[PDB]
Amino acid sequence: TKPHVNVGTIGHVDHGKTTLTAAITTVLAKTYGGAARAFDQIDNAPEEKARGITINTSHVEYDTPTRHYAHVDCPGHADYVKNMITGAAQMDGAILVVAATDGPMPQTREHILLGRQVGVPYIIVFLNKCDMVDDEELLELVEMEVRELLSQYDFPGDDTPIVRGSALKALEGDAEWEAKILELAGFLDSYIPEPERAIDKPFLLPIEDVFSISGRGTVVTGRVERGIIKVGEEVEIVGIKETQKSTCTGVEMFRKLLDEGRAGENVGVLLRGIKREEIERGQVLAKPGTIKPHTKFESEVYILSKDEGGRHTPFFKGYRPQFYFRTTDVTGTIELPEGVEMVMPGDNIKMVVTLIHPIAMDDGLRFAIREGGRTVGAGVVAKVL
Ligand SMILES: Nc1nc2c(ncn2[C@@H]2O[C@H](COP(=O)(O)OP(=O)(O)O)[C@@H](O)[C@H]2O)c(=O)[nH]1
Ligand SMILES: CCCn1nnnc1NC(=O)c1cccc(Cl)c1
Ligand SMILES: [Mg+2]
């Protein structure tokens, strides 16, 4: 029906993220329709687990006239680290809450940095607790600080919408402040562009399996992540070895022959001129020249704690774990940031990885870190090298 957008509140503890979330649901419900949620519901964050990693996360939903929002909110800075690196949803945009009284604080900076590292494309600022501040000059100063901070991490500080509001007053029914929640909603609508639907993006299919079908040749199977592959189209085979070219000479689903395969569908793609031996675990079919193989990259990683089922001991420079991208492990070596000799269970670090075989990747690609099958960490490619 409507574009689905992933958003969430970020910023320092006690600046009013949870209150703002409650106020957004409430104000949009009574204006546009929906179900209002209350501070104490959202504040009481349920614990969720995905492959060992425990995160206290609250999920709410709200609607504007044109868009539907899945909105994430977390109690602790520890959860934001985990959620941003390894969480289910990747954010299309974040709302940075900064309390007008305090101004920018350490976690304000950390979340902006993390935002950049994990590829959070857009940030909008809600300048909160403006009911506690009457001197307009001070609001301007706090705003300028935030704009500066955002620019430091390559966000367009000068151009980022900043809304002067009060989450509490708006949650309590003050129409004058509820108007500011609506201004924020407008910026979500207007400033975060409509998310590209997978079908519209360049074709990509991670290869899960391979067969030689009698009287046709080599078929590669998987789910179409993005785009459309049609019979006759050229495709590249990227990863593990030098990229290969071929033509799609068929798309099968179960027993039905199709002229194309679309994002979301599990299909078998027949490849002209390609042997079964020329297909390796970890490769993707891609629209020619739309995704490149890389061996070395910069990453933000979270290392599982003892409790989460991770390592007991810490690792050092000479650590060579399995890096799980899409379908398969690939061994790699690491380089740690200056003045770091060690990494403990539960730490998160910037980490430069060098893979032994290349993998098709762009910035934003998620991965797990494994030791003989068992997940010991998780991460996201921050910059390809
Ligand atoms: N005066 C005022 N207080 C607020 C506002 N928003 C939140 N608070 C208060 O700040 C405290 C922390 O808010 P909370 O939403 O829990 O912050 P979080 O730690 O970022 O989730 C609570 O006592 C709120 O009532 C506001 O706009 N004005
Ligand atoms: C949870 C699975 C990994 N795991 N779990 N418990 N310990 C480990 N890893 C190691 O012991 C280890 C052994 C030799 C060298 C190094 Cl660098 C690390
Ligand atoms: Mg909170």
Numbering used by the authors: 8 to 392
Authors' own words:
EF-Tu is an essential and universally conserved GTPase that is critical for protein synthesis. EF-Tu delivers aminoacyl-tRNAs (aa-tRNA) to the ribosomal aminoacyl (A) site during the elongation step of translation. During trans-translation, EF-Tu delivers alanyl-tmRNA-SmpB to the empty ribosomal A site. Domains 2 (amino acids 209–299) and 3 (amino acids 301–393) together bind aa-tRNA; domain 3 also interacts with EF-Ts to promote nucleotide exchange.
